[PDB]
Amino acid sequence: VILTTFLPSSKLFIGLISVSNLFMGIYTGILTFLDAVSWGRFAEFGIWWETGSGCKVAGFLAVFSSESAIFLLMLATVERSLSAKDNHLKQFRVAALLAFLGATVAGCFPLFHRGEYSASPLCLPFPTGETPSLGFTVTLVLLNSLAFLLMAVIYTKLYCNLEENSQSSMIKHVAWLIFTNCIFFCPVAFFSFAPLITAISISPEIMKSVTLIFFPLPACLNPVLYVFFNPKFKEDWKLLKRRVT
Amino acid sequence: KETAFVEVVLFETTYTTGLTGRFSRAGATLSAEGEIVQMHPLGLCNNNDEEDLYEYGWVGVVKLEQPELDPKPCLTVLGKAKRAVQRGATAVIFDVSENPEAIDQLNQGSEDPLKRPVVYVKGADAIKLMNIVNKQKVARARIQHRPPRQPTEYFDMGIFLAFFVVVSLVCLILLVKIKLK
Amino acid sequence: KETAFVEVVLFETTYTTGLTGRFSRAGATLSAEGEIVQMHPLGLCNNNDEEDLYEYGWVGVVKLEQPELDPKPCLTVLGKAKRAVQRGATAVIFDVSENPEAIDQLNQGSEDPLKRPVVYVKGADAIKLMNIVNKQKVARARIQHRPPRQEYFDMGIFLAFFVVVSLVCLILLVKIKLK
Numbered sequence: 001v002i003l004t005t006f007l008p009s010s011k012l013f014i015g016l017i018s019v020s021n022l023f024m025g026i027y028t029g030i031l032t033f034l035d036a037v038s039w040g041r042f043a044e045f046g047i048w049w050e051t052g053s054g055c056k057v058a059g060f061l062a063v064f065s066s067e068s069a070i071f072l073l074m075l076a077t078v079e080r081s082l083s084a085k086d087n088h089l090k091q092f093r094v095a096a097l098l099a100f101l102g103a104t105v106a107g108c109f110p111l112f113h114r115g116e117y118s119a120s121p122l123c124l125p126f127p128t129g130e131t132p133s134l135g136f137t138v139t140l141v142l143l144n145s146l147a148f149l150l151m152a153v154i155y156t157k158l159y160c161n162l163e164e165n166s167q168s169s170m171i172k173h174v175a176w177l178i179f180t181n182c183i184f185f186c187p188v189a190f191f192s193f194a195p196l197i198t199a200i201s202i203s204p205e206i207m208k209s210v211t212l213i214f215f216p217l218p219a220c221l222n223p224v225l226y227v228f229f230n231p232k233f234k235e236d237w238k239l240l241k242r243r244v245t
Numbered sequence: 246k247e248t249a250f251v252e253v254v255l256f257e258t259t260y261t262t263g264l265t266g267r268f269s270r271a272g273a274t275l276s277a278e279g280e281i282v283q284m285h286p287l288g289l290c291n292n293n294d295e296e297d298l299y300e301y302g303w304v305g306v307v308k309l310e311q312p313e314l315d316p317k318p319c320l321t322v323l324g325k326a327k328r329a330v331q332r333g334a335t336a337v338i339f340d341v342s343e344n345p346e347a348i349d350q351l352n353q354g355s356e357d358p359l360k361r362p363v364v365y366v367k368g369a370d371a372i373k374l375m376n377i378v379n380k381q382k383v384a385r386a387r388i389q390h391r392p393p394r395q396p397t398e399y400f401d402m403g404i405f406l407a408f409f410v411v412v413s414l415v416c417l418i419l420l421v422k423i424k425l426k
Numbered sequence: 427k428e429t430a431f432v433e434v435v436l437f438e439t440t441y442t443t444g445l446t447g448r449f450s451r452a453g454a455t456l457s458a459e460g461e462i463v464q465m466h467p468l469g470l471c472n473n474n475d476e477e478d479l480y481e482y483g484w485v486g487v488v489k490l491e492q493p494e495l496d497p498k499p500c501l502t503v504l505g506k507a508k509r510a511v512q513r514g515a516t517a518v519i520f521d522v523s524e525n526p527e528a529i530d531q532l533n534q535g536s537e538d539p540l541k542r543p544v545v546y547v548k549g550a551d552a553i554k555l556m557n558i559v560n561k562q563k564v565a566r567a568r569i570q571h572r573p574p575r576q577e578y579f580d581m582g583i584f585l586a587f588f589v590v591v592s593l594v595c596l597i598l599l600v601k602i603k604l605k
């Protein structure tokens with residue numbers, strides 16, 4: 001995806017989201033490598049992983065990849081709304097870099113707390129439950145929940161606005177990304193909010209298993225479907241074939 | 246802290262009568278069995294440096310009295326259980342049907358776990374136990390850990406498939422708006 | 427074949443020593459507790475008219491002998507266990523370390539389950555049990571079965587087959603586009 005992109009405002013947004021998709025994949029590969037090495041002997045490396053330095057690096061990488069999957073997608077709906085209305089292609093990238101870099105401080109804030117990631121091999125600030133960094137887990141979920149409504153209302157009005165046929169392909173692509181994200185991420189927080197409610201009880205064996213398959217999933221399917229669902233991808237891919245052949 | 250289906254045995258021939266009670270967090274929940282030997286709430290004191298000893302292994306029944314009757318109890322309720330285990334008991338059945346506040350007394354004893362089970366039997370089900378300890382000359386108490394079978398890792402297996410059906414179906418209605426555009 | 431968690435206690439401070447064994451499909455598998463009372467294999471016969479009785483509740487230890495040593499055993503291995511429960515025992519512990527065929531003798535007789543647990547301890551673990559029944563004057567035996575957890579292995583099939591179901595459909599979509 002990245003080589004085909006590197007210009008339209010709608011084209012440059014996908015390349016940066018591809019970077020977050022690669023970040024989530026690198027995070028998952030870290031865990032896969034740490035799993036394949038320990039054939040039944042994970043506990044030997046378990047203390048070395050949390051008490052070393054990688055438990056704070058991998059967690060920060062995961063937080064940065066997760067929040068980029070929302071911050072980058074937030075501007076896509078505004079871009080689509082402005083595209084239907086009629087020096088802006090160089091001012092949107094100004095906000096794009098700010099949104100991309102805004103997650104670094106959010107991910108580093110837990111690091112200032114004296115011991116947050118020494119509670120889970122996943123080194124993520126929420127599988128441990130709600131006792132560690134109670135004021136951070138709630139805020140992170142609230143930030144994700146509040147952003148979805150702005151994206152949903154714009155896409156809702158986009159269909160009613162219509163009665164740029166070449167631009168029709170991008171409208172549905174953004175809608176799929178902003179809708180399927182809350183299909184793979186919104187159910188995740190339900191299990192995190194389970195141990196803090198007396199009425200509903202969820203076994204810990206389920207929370208980790210659900211997290212490990214539903215956290216990297218939303219940043220894994222977009223690039224694959226981009227090849228088979230974007231007509232412009234065919235021309236972009238064929239353009240660079242002659243530059244090397 | 247699940248239920249405990251304590252059953253008593255009345256041998257010579259063996260007649261078995263069971264009853265239900267609730268485990269407590271005062272001591273680790275396990276299964277124990279021994280002769281049922283009633284103690285007295287005031288008999289489980291500590292100032293008495295010399296007391297009659299019993300054989301090892303006995304399920305002690307303690308009929309708790311009203312908390313306001315005695316101006317100052319010698320030991321806490323969770324202290325009586327710890328004293329009794331030292332006497333060589335294996336389990337204690339605190340009949341808390343008269344002192345309801347004693348349940349909270351035991352449930353707050355999660356700070357220091359006890360090596361042996363502790364049970365409390367409330368309500369009118371303890372009347373059956375008290376009648377047994379009153380009438381029959383010798384009986385044998387028998388308590389078992391998790392008397393029912395709870396399919397904890399079996400009932401939830403198919404719930405995940407139903408969870409996946411919603412994920413697989415919510416995407417289909419999205420195609421309707423695709424076709425309308 | 428379910429494992430049995432049996433431990434011995436010594437009243438004086440109570441030292442505790444444990445060991446493992448396998449339940450047998452002859453008596454209803456459940457926990458029991460009592461005093462250890464060694465019983466000779468030949469003492470659990472039925473043709474005897476009257477014999478001394480023990481107090482109700484006692485875990486009996488029976489060390490089986492070689493099958494060829496006894497040409498005409500008075501009772502079957504299941505018969506020994508059924509006699510002991512009638513005698514007043516609560517949980518019979520065998521020792522099949524010398525008669526391996528007794529495991530089949532017990533697991534075959536699944537037609538009439540016994541009310542109380544029956545355990546067989548083989549291998550070198552029964553050596554430690556015998557070294558305790560031989561030395562200590564009083565012992566206290568408890569047998570228990572508490573298998574916890576399994577709770578993610580059970581849902582693994584549901585999670586794994588689901589991904590295959592999802593991917594096989596995507597395979598056909600790519601197949602049909604180029605054709």
Ligand SMILES: CC(C)CCC[C@@H](C)[C@H]1CC[C@H]2[C@@H]3CC=C4C[C@@H](O)CC[C@]4(C)[C@H]3CC[C@]12C
Nearest residue numbers: 409410411413414416417420591592595596599
């Ligand atoms: C609960 C689980 C088992 C349900 C699984 C449903 C599967 C089999 C369904 C759900 C969505 C479906 C897809 C929806 C849309 C299309 C596009 C069309 O051009 C080809 C068929 C295809 C690709 C369908 C194939 C079957 C499909 C993948």
Ligand SMILES: CC(C)CCC[C@@H](C)[C@H]1CC[C@H]2[C@@H]3CC=C4C[C@@H](O)CC[C@]4(C)[C@H]3CC[C@]12C
Nearest residue numbers: 221229409412413414416417420423592596599
């Ligand atoms: C149940 C979950 C895990 C499955 C994840 C993949 C889902 C979301 C995928 C699998 C098959 C996909 C479909 C395959 C083909 C088409 C035809 C195209 O013209 C519109 C999109 C559409 C209809 C896709 C929508 C998304 C889809 C249903």
